[PDB]
Design a protein around this ligand. Structure first.
Ligand code: HEC
Ligand code: HEC
Ligand code: HEC
Ligand code: HEC
Ligand code: HEC
Ligand code: HEC
Ligand SMILES: CCCCCCCc1cc(O)c2ccccc2[n+]1[O-]
Ligand SMILES: CCCCCCCc1cc(O)c2ccccc2[n+]1[O-]
Lengths: 51, 146, 144, 50
């Protein structure tokens, strides 16, 4: 069902955005990283308290 | 003549089954699912790297092993396709049990004179890192998906 | 008719495989009284729950079949028509297949350390894995 | 079936970033922190055997 061995390296995925070297506007990262952005937005929650 | 062909098919059949049985026990087969990488890596890095996953994760007995392999196998395919796995992958009761039994299987002689079985429920409650190096920092075990 | 043939085939290989394995373990090996000292020292040691040929034969299927028949044949001969000495010592060949099997199961312990270059064999440090040779005679051996 | 012995025992071969005449202990620390930490145990000066 599958046949080559795992890698000891632990290679982090590599990316190549469409963004310019000096891009700083948060909402420019949105269309290319929707899942992280979605998560980033969860910081907007401001009602939950711990001990 | 004719039955010699039959015999020749017989040996092939069992040889193939046996090979497949063994192959479906080892690290390269198990890690053909990206979800099993953390456990693959930690295994290859550990003292137990040169034994198979099912040397710990399946019963050693031939009769008990065949069904266990097909049940866990079936259940794992299902989880990787139609089901929705969580943020935490934890060994269920049953697998904690077949593993600890296999601890006993290979390290009996070290423990013959000592009630190490009665102290903690499982060996790994002391030998903590045999459980896939759980204590080591996240970055030594895991990355994001591609 | 060929279904009968198939049914004979599976039996044949099942038997051969079982017999292959059985001829690897402590009770088969110790069916010769000359092999008792090694039998006892094995069953007493850390390695009691692995077979003799897990150390004494190659792990490779193609290399193992001939090794088993040659050593086997030679051991039957020595136990019948030949006269063994007072000392039973491993020959060069078997020192070699054993040390290779040391490497086979304890690689990870040794990955970062030139332990292979210091002494010729592992057992030049792990002296008692050699059937407890250091312990007093009475803990290994009795008369026939 | 296949072997599971996917890591084979080999004698370690090393290639450091260090120049051929390096003598400074502290230059060895970054590439070999384990042997170094062990070397540092020689700073212990309070234990007597018999
Ligand atoms: C090779 C033979 C193995 C072995 C020894 C194991 N796996 Fe997997 N597995 C997969 C997924 C998606 C899960 C999560 C299920 C869940 O959410 O509960 C698992 C889980 C496990 C466990 C822990 C749970 C348990 O008790 O069984 C263990 C011990 C385990 N696996 C071992 C996915 C896959 C595969 C995709 C088809 C394959 C192939 C494997 N795993 C292979 C193996
Ligand atoms: C079961 C599979 C085994 C194994 C692993 C060994 N034996 Fe035997 N053996 C027998 C006799 C008479 C001798 C002495 C001959 C002599 O003095 O030269 C031996 C010797 C050995 C050795 C040392 C020689 C070597 O090959 O290096 C070893 C490693 C060894 N044995 C292992 C006789 C018998 C038997 C009677 C027929 C049987 C059965 C076995 N041995 C079984 C095994
Ligand atoms: C690995 C852990 C071993 C197992 C399991 C068994 N033996 Fe052994 N054997 C082992 C070593 C390292 C040696 C000596 C190697 C050397 O270079 O001297 C031996 C030797 C023997 C001998 C005779 C030579 C001797 O040193 O006494 C015999 C007859 C023998 N081995 C057979 C044997 C049997 C029958 C075992 C099962 C009961 C067995 N060995 C287990 C390592 C290991
Ligand atoms: C030395 C024995 C051993 C070997 C070999 C081994 N594991 Fe594990 N495994 C464990 C232990 C111990 C646990 C945790 C048991 C518990 O929860 O009590 C575990 C748990 C797991 C889990 C989920 C639980 C967790 O803590 O992550 C997965 C998935 C898994 N094993 C798969 C594998 C795969 C794939 C391999 C092969 C690369 C492998 N194991 C090799 C001992 C082993
Ligand atoms: C096929 C597997 C296998 C082979 C071959 C093997 N060992 Fe082991 N070894 C094991 C296992 C399994 C244990 C642990 C058993 C226990 O914990 O009681 C062990 C334990 C040990 C130990 C600790 C116990 C002791 O008696 O010192 C040493 C040292 C050791 N092995 C070295 C060796 C050497 C040296 C050889 C070669 C002569 C060898 N091993 C051959 C699998 C093997
Ligand atoms: C079928 C074989 C097998 C099984 C199953 C097995 N071991 Fe091991 N284990 C070995 C062998 C062989 C070594 C020696 C590794 C080496 O020297 O490279 C070892 C090494 C170890 C070590 C030393 C390295 C370390 O990680 O600390 C511990 C502790 C250990 N085993 C405990 C366990 C526990 C706990 C389990 C159950 C999860 C277990 N073993 C299952 C064969 C096995
Ligand atoms: C009909 C038997 C052939 C199918 C082999 C299945 C292989 C298989 C697949 C898994 O996902 C496993 C997960 C945990 C433990 C064992 C596992 N085995 O053996
Ligand atoms: C079914 C064919 C098997 C042939 C019988 C050989 C058994 C046998 C007998 C021995 O005396 C040995 C001595 C040292 C190493 C291996 C040995 N094997 O394998």
């Amino acid at each position: 069902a599958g046949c080559s061995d795992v890698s000891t390296e632990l290679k982090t995925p590599v990316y190549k955005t469409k963004l310019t070297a000096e891009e700083i506007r948060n909402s420019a990262f949105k269309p290319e990283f929707p899942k992280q952005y979605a998560s980033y937005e969860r910081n907007d929650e401001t009602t939950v308290m711990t001990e | 003549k004719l039955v010699l062909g039959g015999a020749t098919l017989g040996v092939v059949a069992l040889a193939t089954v046996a090979f497949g049985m063994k192959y479906t026990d080892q690290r390269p087969f198990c890690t053909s699912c990206h979800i099993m990488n953390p456990v693959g890596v930690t295994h290859k890095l550990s003292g137990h790297a040169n034994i198979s996953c099912n040397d710990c994760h399946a019963p050693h007995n031939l009769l008990a092993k065949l069904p266990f392999k097909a049940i866990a196998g079936a259940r794992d395919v299902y989880m990787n396709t139609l089901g929705h796995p969580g943020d935490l992958i934890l060994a269920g009761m049953e697998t904690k049990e077949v593993v600890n039994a296999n601890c006993k299987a290979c390290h009996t002689m070290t423990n013959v004179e000592v009630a190490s079985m009665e102290a903690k429920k499982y060996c790994t409650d002391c030998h903590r890192n045999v459980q896939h190096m759980r204590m080591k920092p996240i970055s030594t075990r895991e990355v994001a998906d591609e």
